[PDB]
Design a protein around this ligand. Sequence first.
Ligand SMILES: Nc1ncnc2c1ncn2[C@@H]1O[C@H](COP(=O)(O)OP(=O)(O)OP(O)(O)=S)[C@@H](O)[C@H]1O
Lengths: 69, 63, 127, 127, 398
Amino acid sequence: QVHIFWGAPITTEVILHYRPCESDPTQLPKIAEKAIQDFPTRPLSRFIPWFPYDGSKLPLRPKRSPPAS
Amino acid sequence: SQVHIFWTEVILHYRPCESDPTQLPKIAEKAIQDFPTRPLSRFIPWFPYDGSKLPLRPKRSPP
Amino acid sequence: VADVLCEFLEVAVHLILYVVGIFQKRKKYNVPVQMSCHPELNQYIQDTLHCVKPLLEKNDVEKVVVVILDKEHRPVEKFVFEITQPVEQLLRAFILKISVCDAVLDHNPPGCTFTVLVHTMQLYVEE
Amino acid sequence: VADVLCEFLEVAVHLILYVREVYPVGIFQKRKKYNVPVQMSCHPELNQYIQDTLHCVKPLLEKNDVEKVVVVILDKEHRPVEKFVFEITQVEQLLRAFILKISVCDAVLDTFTVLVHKMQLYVEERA
Amino acid sequence: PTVHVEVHQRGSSTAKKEDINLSVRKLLNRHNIGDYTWTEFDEPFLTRNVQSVSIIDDLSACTVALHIFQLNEDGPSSENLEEETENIIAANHWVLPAAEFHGLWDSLVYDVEVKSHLLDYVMTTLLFSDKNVNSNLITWNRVVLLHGPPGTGKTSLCKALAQKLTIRLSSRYRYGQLIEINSHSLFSKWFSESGKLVTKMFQKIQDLIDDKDALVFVLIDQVESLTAARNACRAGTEPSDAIRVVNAVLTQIDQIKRHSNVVILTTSNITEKIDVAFVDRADIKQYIGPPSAAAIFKIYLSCLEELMKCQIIYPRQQLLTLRELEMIGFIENNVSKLSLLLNDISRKSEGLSGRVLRKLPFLAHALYVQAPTVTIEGFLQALSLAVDKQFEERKKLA
Ligand SMILES: Nc1ncnc2c1ncn2[C@@H]1O[C@H](COP(=O)(O)OP(=O)(O)OP(O)(O)=S)[C@@H](O)[C@H]1O
């Protein structure tokens, strides 16, 4: 069962929720059948540093200290 | 308080297999409303039974 | 009792689809009624009432509005069934009320294409 | 407990909306209202909007027909460009984690409709 | 033979298509009587679910085909750049059939039968498409040119075409798209950036074409601006606009030639100063000329019975068409005089552009008659003076 709340103002059956006070969407169901269908699913890409902490490449540093409080 | 449209916070129903009606939701609104009823007419047979008159009976019986 | 009331709503919705040759006499609830043999429609109306079933498990309900549509899906007729939901003659008495209603009144084109509604034993018709 | 997991989903939906910059109106600001370190919306219209969307899925979620809470972020064509899919298989540890999750999940990534087909949030995004 | 019938379904009407078809066929077979249009009906369903029925070129024949259409309410969508979203492309996007386009195909009046030629062109295109002819062996560039005098409704005919085709060919393509191309907002000229800009809007055209269940019409205004004559122009001072923006469109249009659900419609003003390698890549280059006497009379009629329809000219006198005047043989009579005087205005108002023709009632009811309700032959006199007012005004601006 699939529950397509068109809203947020700017086999398997479908329990869509209409809840109207406007009567002027003119498209819940196709957009409901749009929100229902799976589309080109990008694989979960993985994270990695590209600049690691090199022991042979070391940083800079300025002298002064911040005003403590 | 709730109305359902087996086609007020409305719980419509879709049944995706039937989905020929390109514009569904506006169809769904029409089914809900009331509209002027005609009176349930208290009915009366027009030709009533007068006890002063007697009807007709043929003699014969089925076998 | 809600379950058997839903089966009587089955009896209603579909026999009122009748109240042409694609329909047939068969024993329902110990009366012969002339409905349709359609198994798809049988299980589809069963599904309508059994989704109405949890609705009545809520017990908050007003009407079971079995809208007999026209072919336009824009009601020229209708059949609101305002049962104020909290022996065979009375289980047939409801059917005789609806038959006398369609008697003084009239039906719609053969395929009534009706869409059952609910608003969550007595009735009338908004013609 | 679902009476506060719905508000956890509230947290989720607005934080997605917030990090995605789906609107330039910067209404969002830190809100520990009733000691919840989460960043909801300051539109009571929309807080009660999530409240009653979850209210009308409350006869609908814990019935366990749920196979995935797909918070779609819609598009200009109202298209599911980013289906934030949450599997319904259920103590702040998850919450921040989910929060964490969402953030680290937006890590790779760059108008919402709450469709309802380890809270393994995964994003089906356009390639 | 065959006759075509089109029926306006209301947007707030939602009955199924086949019920509408059956009801209109029922009305036709009951009536079964020329090219007049029905407006009066006798069925509550058909009233609340129909607006009008019309016959497009008195016979009880039953060679009837029904086209049912829905003129889309909202107007144009806008097309802007992908990353330069400010103003780079700004193309107009009509989702046909569209509201602002109806009645347009009827109003236009010509005398060279452009409508039939330019409609049965697309009909034969579809015939050759469905029969699977060797596209390597018999081909068409899917480009139609219309050129002629300014203000003579050259571009009006293209929107009418698109509307009539998305109406006629319904149930063969769910809908049509019409992309109006602004040939003046694609000249960001510093070293061939416009010649690179044509590419993006044509990729968007490709996007709207691959939706193979939608008939798309690409309407290019001022096709002389995009394709400037490069050869005869002895101006080497044109660095890369006359050579790398015409060559940047002569390819993208030879690329959509392979597809079949696209038609290119172009409107030109100057016959010369256009690339000779684009007056070969157009199937029909039809000339739209200034209205002629009979055409002027018919347009003036259209205006006058329009005014009578809205009760402006309150005393309704039968305006006799030119065919009835020919039949009587120009005989002066107490009702036939008004048509004669109209016809004298027609010769006197000869040579004007259709746009000023469709203006002239406005002025003739503006200055010469202030009456909220006008009797005929004074309004006609107002026209006969306002036309000379237009001649003298044109002479005033030298
Ligand atoms: N020949 C005609 N017959 C009837 N109406 C005409 C005719 N020509 C023009 N019109 C009216 O003219 C109005 C607009 O015409 P346009 O098509 O814009 O002229 P046009 O040919 O576009 O000129 P350009 O090329 O864009 S300057 C429309 O409302 C038409 O009804």
